[PDB]
Write a protein that binds this ligand. Structure first.
Ligand SMILES: *[C@@H]1O[C@H](CO)[C@@H](O[C@@H]2O[C@H](CO)[C@@H](O)[C@H](O)[C@H]2NC(C)=O)[C@H](O[C@H]2O[C@@H](C)[C@@H](O)[C@@H](O)[C@@H]2O)[C@H]1NC(C)=O
Ligand SMILES: *[C@@H]1O[C@H](CO)[C@@H](O[C@H]2O[C@H](CO)[C@@H](O)[C@H](O)[C@H]2NC(C)=O)[C@H](O[C@@H]2O[C@@H](C)[C@@H](O)[C@@H](O)[C@@H]2O)[C@H]1NC(C)=O
Ligand SMILES: *[C@@H]1O[C@H](CO)[C@@H](O[C@@H]2O[C@H](CO)[C@@H](O)[C@H](O)[C@H]2NC(C)=O)[C@H](O)[C@H]1NC(C)=O
Ligand SMILES: *[C@@H]1O[C@H](CO)[C@@H](O[C@H]2O[C@H](CO)[C@@H](O)[C@H](O)[C@H]2NC(C)=O)[C@H](O)[C@H]1NC(C)=O
Ligand SMILES: CO[C@H]1O[C@H](CO)[C@H](O)[C@H](O)[C@H]1O
Ligand SMILES: CO[C@H]1O[C@H](CO)[C@H](O)[C@H](O)[C@H]1O
Ligand SMILES: [Ca+2]
Ligand SMILES: [Ca+2]
Ligand SMILES: [Mn+2]
Ligand SMILES: [Mn+2]
Lengths: 237, 237
């Protein structure tokens, strides 16, 4: 069974999407993950957007795991370079029917009290204690401390194209980040065994966060906009 | 140990490179692996360019294999589309002090009567027996029949940016191909154990070939230009 969907833009009130927390779809058809009040992003914001139907990434009966490819474009504008922008966005895969975890360096996907499994690709802008220099792309499994990391220079408010491909045969998760206007390319790959970590059915989506209050910097912020999104998955069983 | 070099453009008789067969460096600072007379690519051509010094991909004493990243831009101009362009170019790693193999579908890296091992990434423009639809990026290990292959649409005469990266820890070889003018991105990856196929020291370079006489089509040709090239490898021990 193969599943696919694509959004060249988001129409206000998408019946195909589950917006959670601060996530909204602006009038101009862009999906805003964290709050932006009148052209200016706010600190203390956290939002998620999941595809509304669970996609089966593996089947017990056959043991077969799916291969998938997801491509999307996003933009992160950092108005205030002054103290430190934060926190970044992630494309994640988690069990179905979850809720926004902790904000700040957890991007809304990790809940310190009751942790649930998840595979995520992160585009990190704030250097937390467990973090290497930022910004960096990172591969997260059940945690926010990336198994693999690679730094990237941001195209401030520019467009970024992302290709995340997973080969079930090689168990390789490869992500590419291209900033078309700069012409810069960044790649990162790691071996991930979805069958070990996540359940048969999952929800795929994005989560982003702005600076946490307990950091005190009201300028610990930026936008986390996603312009388009496509995903395709093939379970041979 | 760490080794790295960068070619922003090639100069005539670059001491750092070793040209072989038809390969030459034009006055315009471009590396033409295969012959092109008066702006027209010729058939029956093969050329190689290797970096003058050997690099160490692993050490037997410690058993440490090197991680590396290489980036280059190429341009393939297919003037006569009618018959069928041939054959392509490859980035390849081989034992030191080798000689140009068989042109045509072997790109000049394979010699059927005295085979040497190699790890190469190809950009295949002509479909041989052992081939799937072309053009395609393919990961070749000791053979021209790829282990992994991904189809891609060429930007005829246009520029392509390639990023090849190998992580020793995961043994992942991930390659990215981006056509800037076209805004296209293609990604392919595969687990390759350099240690299991190559010697401690190697040569890195490119190789290209136009249509072989044994095909009669004198139009089985295209250019195989290399605009720039940067390389970096790191061996812990
Ligand atoms: C950052 O955002 C949250 C959510 O907007 C603020 O709190 C309020 O949050 C609680 C949920 O824990 C909710 O029940 C309240 O209705 C909500 N109220 C308002 C007016 O925002 C959070 O902080 C603040 O904490 C609450 C308890 C309230 O005292 C408010 O005045 C205070 O600012 C925000 N923190 C900062 C520092 O902006
Ligand atoms: C090899 O390349 C030639 C140039 O691209 C092709 O020929 C010509 O192209 C078109 C027809 O496809 C004509 O409008 C041009 O006037 C031709 N130009 C020249 C310089 O030859 C050629 O295609 C073929 O050869 C031409 C001359 C005709 O006889 C066609 O029947 C034939 O397809 C191409 N070679 C081959 C073997 O396809
Ligand atoms: C294809 O290419 C080869 C190399 O350019 C041609 O061959 C050569 O001709 C000279 C002069 O006789 C010899 O010294 C070379 O050593 C030859 N090379 C080989 C491999 O035989 C070859 O004839 C060309 N074929 C066609 C049809 O143009
Ligand atoms: C947070 O960012 C602001 C805005 O960039 C910083 O404040 C000021 O910024 C410029 C340089 O400091 C001034 O020229 C601006 O006029 C002024 N902006 C405003 C709205 O007053 C501020 O210093 C930063 N805060 C911290 C803690 O670094
Ligand atoms: C000091 O850290 C805390 O606040 C900053 C804001 O300055 C970041 O949000 C970070 O995620 C959070 O842990
Ligand atoms: C017919 O096959 C032979 O000629 C064609 C050109 O037409 C290619 O060069 C191919 O690699 C070679 O083996
Ligand atoms: Ca962080
Ligand atoms: Ca071929
Ligand atoms: Mn991180
Ligand atoms: Mn091939």
């Amino acid at each position: 069974k193969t599943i696919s969907f694509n959004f060249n833009q988001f129409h206000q009130n998408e019946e195909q999407l589950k917006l959670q927390r601060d996530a909204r779809i602006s009038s101009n058809s862009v999906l805003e993950l964290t709050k932006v009040v009148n052209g200016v992003p706010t600190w203390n914001s956290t939002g998620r957007a999941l595809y509304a139907k669970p996609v089966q990434v593996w089947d017990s009966t056959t043991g077969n795991v799916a291969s998938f490819e997801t491509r999307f474009s996003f933009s992160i504008r950092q108005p205030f370079p002054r103290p430190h922008p934060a926190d970044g966005l992630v494309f994640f895969i988690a069990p179905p029917n979850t809720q926004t975890g902790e904000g700040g360096g957890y991007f809304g996907i990790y809940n310190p009290l009751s942790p649930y499994p998840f595979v995520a690709v992160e585009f990190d802008t704030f250097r937390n204690t467990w973090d290497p220099q930022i910004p960096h792309i990172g591969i997260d499994v059940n945690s926010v401390i990336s198994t693999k990391t690679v730094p990237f220079t941001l195209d401030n408010g520019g467009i970024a194209n992302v290709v995340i491909k997973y080969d079930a045969s090689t168990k390789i998760l490869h992500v590419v980040l291209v900033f078309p206007s700069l012409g810069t390319i960044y790649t990162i790959a790691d071996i991930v065994d979805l069958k070990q970590v996540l359940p048969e059915s999952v929800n795929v989506g994005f989560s982003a966060a702005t600076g946490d209050p307990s950091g005190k910097q009201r300028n610990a912020t930026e936008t986390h906009d996603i312009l388009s999104w496509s995903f395709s998955a093939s379970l041979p069983g």
